[PDB]
């Protein structure tokens, strides 16, 4: 008959959701978005470079020195600075680290919003060894600022590649042990397999990345196609599925777990000796036994921590596989100590985009599944 | 296993196209149809009495048997380094006298502005500060105020523990701020012996 | 729907040679000879995609946005499938103050390229929901942070503000902390907006160099 | 299978605060310590942007360019994968 | 000529009495919007509505736009077959 | 590339590779040929005459056509074609056939009606390392 | 005859038509009345009656459109029209010609040493 | 010979604001600020 739609608010406790069911199945999805909008794009013009960096450790906040890495290549990309070797190194295996934290807590929030709460837990106390190796070299346990223009902040502390590998010696213990509750186990199948599935022209059509564009049969990984630092050296698989599935995506998350732990194995046996951080002392701020001994490094220290150094006019957009998908940043320069225009693109913003067209034919306990395999955060979906 | 079944399949349009097309025969991921009596009795063991919740089932009957990463805080503590960003705090010389020479770089490179500074000429004409304020309620406990001070006189130091009841404890001014350095100076100092190393 | 996954074994190349060449070199040219009208100005610059390379950057009208774009996603040697965001810059010095940006990339041979839109406040953008799916929340939230109205969108909503927020907060000219703020009455019993005070004020340094020679 | 929770100094056996051998930390390259000469390094300040010739009554001969391009599977020459950024010798 | 024409032209007068941009002793039975009150099209809107409020109706916009006087109101409202 | 599926998969027959990545089901049921390629691209050889003679976006095209077919032409099995061209077959066909879609509406913008003395200024970027390293 | 094709006296007959709806929903039965409502927002309309641009008018009545969308969908409850709408009318028409023969200066002088902001 | 800050991105900037048809785009008195959407009494200053 002539059957309107019924309507449902889902949630103001930082997703809301306005459904439309023709019965127990979804007609139409609409997100509501903003409640977490805190205006960073419009702060950061307020900030000089140096200043305007740890926002970005608040955008993705379960995956934060990737956030840090596109910001820090879009300026060393117009500074025209690079890099020392040893500073690559870090900065690749300590992306790695940060991957492999964020796809622990994707997978296992996805289970417990399907029902399964103990990988949760098994998961969290190898996030907790991660926490405290961002701790050894930072000081913070998740808002490091670690990157920096022209390389890393400090050096790595002496014992800590000694404990990265003992972790890593037991890490894929864990995940094998986080498998025998989930992937052959028919209430996980009945909930995940053919559930919003997105093939390649959609994918591509809806902008989308990261193990959602993988999961659907798109070789198509930027450490390997435009690679940035050291990741051209590293040898690993990119993971491939071609169903466009829940369970799908589930799989290529752990082996992209497993190839990240292929790659920290290969970054501790080739971390060199050196430098690292790039040697142009107008742009790196000096070593403190420097800057209390001679002059030019005082007078350096005291510019570049006020007016900061000024970046040449231009643009540039440069990207990063986050462990979410792309992350980009659009940065404009005028030519002053603070930046003209600092727009951000996040991969989550894309990817709940597409709600409304993989929840049509679904029910109303498939939107969790839906939304948690999407994997969003919403501090870089409201910047 | 990762392998599918015509009817392990979550949605309505694969459910509809399993029982009426065979194309999921063509598809390598699905589990084959059996051939014979073995298989069939294999299938039916796979499907009807379960053995596949019980290894499930046995991986948390042995972790409940296993060894517990439970903390008893506040008797046992977490482990943290040297370089951990804690409650800010204001430092002396051996002699007694301040580091802070007012130069106002750490309230330059605040990105929070949470800090407040004035400061005049002191009678033997040293040059000291009269207010230092930091709002820990605008902090981020990035630690730049701690690599812009040229002197080593605001640092972060290792206390973690100083939560209040009323906001107006959290908005710390200059006494405080020395009275923190006083009470965690030697332990600042230890920390310090080993991150000048690398700083 | 490309980049499919066809080699099984470790690639240890990005390209080939003659394509990375005229992608590389050529492409700018090639666009401008092809569809001469459709370009008003090129920038030959830094390269989204890497480093170590160079990419276009093509100025267009209004007026022939739609086809442009639509030329570069279904040419056969620009096949630019995936639109990664659309944004504005202010610059309220010119007569048309804004600059809508729209950022693409081919799968199909490792590119990127930039577009760009001058219009001011008063002049619509023809919507590209049509050509790309994604282009409708972007151009909302564009509308939203500058005002830049898109025409023919199918529903062109802010996106990210407050519900009764007028406004577009990313112009030069609008305040950082703005107008209104936010709390609690008693009396009343509801979340009430109030006209803006701060305990403390923002402090602007102006740390700026009378000797320094890269300001623009 | 590799047990969680190792045991007693088989894990981060010297605290960060007491590690048992001094570290001696690079800041500087032994070529820039009496070298310090900046306008030879002077990456940031030396780019150009040229305005082109009008780009109008050009020659693009597209013989030429699908005159290069291969016909065979074998003749086929790829760009390989760039190992590391340049570092310029740091 | 559903209803009468002498209770609807006084219920048009009542409703018209209580604007305040108008004079409660210049409205005549026969007069018009636009020379003779000085109303521009917004007043005309609010006007047809308080005689929509008034007779219980609904007059679209295309009618409400040929409605230029209080004889033409009187007029359509006569005319009407659901009026009250 | 790495098959997250545990079973053991050939990969070897290409139509298991092609039934795997999900080209058969999410591009193209029926398998791309030889013939399909240059029966579509003659389709845009024959679209293509809408463009005037002298106009360069009629020269481009035709040019990457009749590159496309002789590449068909001096290779005689698909799997050749795959390795030349870079794409699977059924891409290279939905290629060829987006070409020819365009082809109606670009002729109806007319992109080639601009004046005699038309001017576009170019910008070029040069790195600092062409005069700073070694020549 | 009706400058820019008449459309400020039909987004006015639009939200007229919206208008008892929004009484209902917001339960201002006993606040204000439709007649007074109707007069307010008639008054919201008569402050950019000298607008020459009609690329001015059209986004005009695009953002009218959208206030009146997030008054419909309950995005901005009753206090939010008491605080916004209906009292600074009320506040334009109930200070004219007040009880006391001061100048609005001179009540500016006792109030502050400078302008009041916002309202 | 011209060389007037000819080694910078500000060539790009000078031209893409002599861009034709949006070089003459212009407003009436006060018409900006009414679609600005800020308070109007921001304007009496
Ligand atoms: C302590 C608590 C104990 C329970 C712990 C485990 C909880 C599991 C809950 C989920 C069970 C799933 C389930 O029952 O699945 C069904 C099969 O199993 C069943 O039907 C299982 C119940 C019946 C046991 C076997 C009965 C026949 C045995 C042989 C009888 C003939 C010989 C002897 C006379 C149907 O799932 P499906 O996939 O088969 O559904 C066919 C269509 N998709
Ligand atoms: C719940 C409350 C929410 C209300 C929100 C909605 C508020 C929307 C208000 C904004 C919409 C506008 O102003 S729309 C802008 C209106 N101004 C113009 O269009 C410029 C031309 N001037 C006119 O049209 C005048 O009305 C006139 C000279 C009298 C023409 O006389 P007539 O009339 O005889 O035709
Ligand atoms: S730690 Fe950061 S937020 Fe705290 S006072 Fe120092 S610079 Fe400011
Ligand atoms: S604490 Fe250090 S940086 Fe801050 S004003 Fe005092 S001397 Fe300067």
């Given at each position: 008959a002539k059957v309107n739609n019924f309507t449902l608010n889902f949630g103001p406790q930082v997703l809301r959701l306005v459904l439309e069911m023709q019965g127990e199945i979804i007609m139409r999805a609409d997100p509501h978005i903003?409640?977490?909008?805190?205006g960073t794009e419009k702060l950061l013009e307020y900030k000089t470079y140096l200043q305007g960096?740890?926002?970005?450790?608040?955008?993705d906040y379960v995956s934060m020195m990737c956030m840090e890495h596109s910001y820090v290549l879009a300026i060393e990309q117009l500074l025209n600075v690079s890099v020392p070797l040893r500073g690559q190194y870090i900065r690749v295996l300590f992306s790695e680290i940060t991957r492999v934290l964020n796809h622990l807590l994707a997978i296992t929030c996805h289970s417990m919003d399907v029902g399964a709460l103990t990988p949760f837990l098994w998961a969290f106390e190898e996030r907790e060894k991660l926490f405290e190796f961002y701790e050894r070299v930072?000081?913070?346990?998740?808002?490091?600022?670690?990157?920096?223009?022209?390389?890393?902040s400090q050096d790595l502390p002496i014992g800590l590649l000694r404990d990265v590998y003992d972790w890593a010696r037991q890490f894929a213990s864990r995940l094998d042990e986080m498998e025998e509750?989930?992937?052959?186990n028919r209430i996980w199948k009945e909930r995940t397999?053919?559930?919003?599935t997105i093939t390649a022209q959609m994918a591509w059509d809806w902008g989308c990345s990261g193990p959602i564009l993988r999961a659907s049969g798109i070789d198509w990984d930027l450490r390997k196609?435009?690679?940035?630092?050291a990741y051209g050296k590293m040898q690993f698989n990119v993971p491939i599925a071609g169903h466009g599935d829940c369970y799908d995506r589930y799989l290529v998350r752990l082996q992209e777990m497993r190839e990240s732990l292929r790659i920290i194995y290969q970054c501790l046996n080739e971390?060199?000796?050196?430098?690292?951080?790039?040697?142009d002392g107008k742009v790196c701020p000096p070593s403190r036994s420097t800057m209390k001994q001679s002059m030019e490094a005082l007078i350096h220290h005291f510019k570049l921590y006020t007016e900061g150094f000024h970046v040449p006019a231009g643009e540039t957009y440069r990207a990063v596989e986050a462990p979410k998908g792309e992350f980009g940043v659009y940065l404009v320069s005028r030519?002053?100590?603070?930046?003209?225009r600092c727009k951000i693109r996040s991969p989550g913003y894309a990817h709940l985009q597409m709600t409304d067209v993989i929840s049509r034919?679904?029910?109303?306990?498939d939107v969790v599944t839906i939304i948690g395999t999407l994997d969003v955060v919403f501090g870089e979906i409201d910047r | 296993g990762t392998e599918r079944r015509p009817?392990?399949?979550?949605?309505?349009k694969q459910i509809e196209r399993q029982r009426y097309a065979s194309?999921?025969?063509?598809?390598?991921?699905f589990k084959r149809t059996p051939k014979n009596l073995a298989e069939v009795l294999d299938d039916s063991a796979s499907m009807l009495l379960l053995t596949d919740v019980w290894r499930g089932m046995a991986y948390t009957l042995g972790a409940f048997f296993d060894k517990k990463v439970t903390i008893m805080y506040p008797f046992e503590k977490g482990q943290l380094s040297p370089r951990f960003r804690g409650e800010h705090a204001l430092r002396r010389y051996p002699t007694g006298?301040?580091?802070?020479?007012?130069?106002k770089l750490c309230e330059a490179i605040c990105p929070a502005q949470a800090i407040t500074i004035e400061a005049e000429e002191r009678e033997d004409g040293s040059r000291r500060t009269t207010r230092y304020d930091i709002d820990m309620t605008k902090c981020?406990?990035?630690?730049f105020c701690q690599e812009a001070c040229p002197v080593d006189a605001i640092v972060e130091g290792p206390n973690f523990e100083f939560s209040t009841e009323?906001?107006?404890?959290?908005?710390?001014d200059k006494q405080k701020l020395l009275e923190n350095g006083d009470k965690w100076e030697t332990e600042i100092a230890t920390n310090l012996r080993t991150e000048s190393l690398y700083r | 729907g490309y980049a499919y996954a066809r080699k099984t074994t470790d690639k240890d190349?990005?390209?080939s040679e003659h394509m990375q060449a005229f992608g590389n070199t050529q492409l700018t040219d090639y666009i401008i000879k092809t569809?001469?009208?459709?370009?008003?100005m090129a920038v030959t610059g830094p390269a989204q995609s890497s480093v170590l390379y160079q990419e276009p950057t093509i100025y267009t009208t209004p007026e022939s946005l739609v086809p442009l774009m639509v030329f570069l996603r279904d040419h056969t040697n620009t096949?630019?499938?995936?639109?990664?965001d659309v944004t504005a810059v202010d610059f309220?010095?010119?007569?048309?103050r804004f600059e809508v940006v729209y950022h693409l990339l081919s799968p199909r041979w490792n590119n990127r390229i930039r577009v760009k839109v001058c219009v001011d406040e008063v002049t619509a953008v023809p919507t590209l929901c049509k050509v790309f799916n994604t282009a409708n929340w972007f151009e909302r939230e564009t509308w939203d942070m500058f005002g830049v109205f898109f025409s023919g969108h199918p529903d062109l909503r802010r996106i990210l503000?407050?519900?009764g927020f007028t406004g577009?907060?990313?112009?030069?000219?609008?305040?950082?902390?703005?107008?209104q703020e936010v709390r609690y009455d008693y009396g009343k019993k509801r979340v009430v907006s109030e006209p803006l005070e701060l305990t403390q004020e923002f402090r602007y340094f102006d740390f700026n160099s009378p000797w320094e020679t890269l300001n623009r | 299978f590799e047990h969680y929770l190792p045991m007693?100094?088989?894990?981060?056996?010297?605290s960060p605060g007491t590690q048992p051998v001094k570290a001696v930390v690079p800041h500087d390259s032994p070529k820039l310590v009496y070298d310090i000469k900046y306008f030879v390094r002077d990456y940031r300040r030396n780019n150009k942007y040229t305005a082109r010739?009008?780009?109008?009554?050009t020659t693009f001969d597209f013989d030429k360019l699908y005159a290069?391009?291969?016909?065979?599977?074998?003749?086929v020459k790829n760009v390989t994968r760039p190992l590391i950024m340049p570092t310029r010798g740091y | 000529g559903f209803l009468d024409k002498d209770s609807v032209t006084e219920r048009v007068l009542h409703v018209t009495?209580?604007?305040?941009?108008?004079?409660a002793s210049k409205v005549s039975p026969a007069a018009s919007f636009?020379?003779?009150?000085?109303?521009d099209s917004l007043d005309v809107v609010e006007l047809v509505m308080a005689l929509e409020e008034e007779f219980g109706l609904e007059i679209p916009d295309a009618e409400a736009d040929k409605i230029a006087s209080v004889g033409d109101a009187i007029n359509y409202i006569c005319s009407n077959p659901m009026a009250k | 590339f790495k098959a997250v599926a545990d079973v053991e998969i050939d990969f070897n027959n290409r139509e298991v590779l092609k039934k795997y990545v999900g080209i058969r089901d999410h591009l193209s049921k029926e398998p791309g040929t030889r013939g399909k390629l240059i029966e579509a691209l003659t389709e845009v050889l024959s679209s293509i005459?809408?463009?005037?003679?002298?106009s360069d976006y009629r020269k481009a095209v035709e040019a990457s056509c009749i590159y496309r077919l002789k590449v068909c032409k001096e290779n005689e099995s698909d799997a050749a074609i795959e390795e030349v061209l870079d794409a699977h077959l059924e891409e290279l066909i939905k290629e060829a056939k987006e070409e020819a879609r365009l082809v109606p509406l670009i002729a109806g913008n007319?992109?080639?009606?601009?004046?005699?003395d038309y001017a576009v200024p170019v910008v070029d970027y040069t790195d600092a390392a062409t005069i700073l390293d070694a020549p | 005859k009706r400058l820019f094709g008449g459309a400020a006296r039909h987004f006015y007959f639009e939200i007229c038509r919206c208008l008892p709806f929004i009484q209902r929903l917001h339960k201002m039965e006993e606040m204000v009345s439709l007649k007074e409502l109707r007069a307010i927002v008639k008054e919201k309309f008569k402050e950019?009656?000298?607008?020459?641009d009609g690329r001015v008018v059209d986004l005009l009545i695009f953002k009218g459109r959208e206030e009146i969308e997030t008054y419909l969908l309950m995005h901005k409850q009753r206090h939010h029209v008491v605080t916004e709408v209906v009292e600074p009318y009320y506040a334009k028409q109930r200070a004219?010609?007040?009880?006391?023969?001061?100048?609005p200066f001179l009540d500016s002088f006792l109030s502050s040493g400078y302008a009041a902001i916002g309202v | 010979e011209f060389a007037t800050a000819?080694?910078?991105?500000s060539i790009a900037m000078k031209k893409a604001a002599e861009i034709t048809g949006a070089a003459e785009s212009a407003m009436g008195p006060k018409e900006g600020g009414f679609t600005a959407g800020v308070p109007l009494d921001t304007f009496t200053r």
């Open positions: 903003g409640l977490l909008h805190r960096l740890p926002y970005f450790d608040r955008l930072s000081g913070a346990r998740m808002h490091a600022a670690y990157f920096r223009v022209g390389g890393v509750l989930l992937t052959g397999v053919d559930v919003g196609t435009q690679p940035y630092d971390m060199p000796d050196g430098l690292y951080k790039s040697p030519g002053g100590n603070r930046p003209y034919g679904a029910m109303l306990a | 009817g392990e399949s979550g949605a309505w194309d999921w025969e063509n598809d390598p991921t006298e301040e580091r802070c020479i007012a130069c981020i406990y990035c630690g009323t906001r107006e404890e959290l908005l710390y | 190349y990005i390209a569809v001469p009208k459709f370009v008003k096949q630019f499938k995936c639109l990664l309220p010095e010119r007569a048309a503000t407050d519900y577009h907060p990313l112009r030069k000219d609008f305040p950082m902390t703005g107008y | 007693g100094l088989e894990y981060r056996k010297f010739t009008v780009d109008a009554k290069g391009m291969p016909t065979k599977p074998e003749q | 009495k209580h604007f305040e941009k108008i004079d636009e020379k003779d009150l000085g109303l | 005459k809408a463009a005037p003679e002298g007319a992109p080639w009606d601009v004046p005699a | 950019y009656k000298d607008v020459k004219v010609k007040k009880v006391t023969t001061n100048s | 000819s080694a910078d991105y």
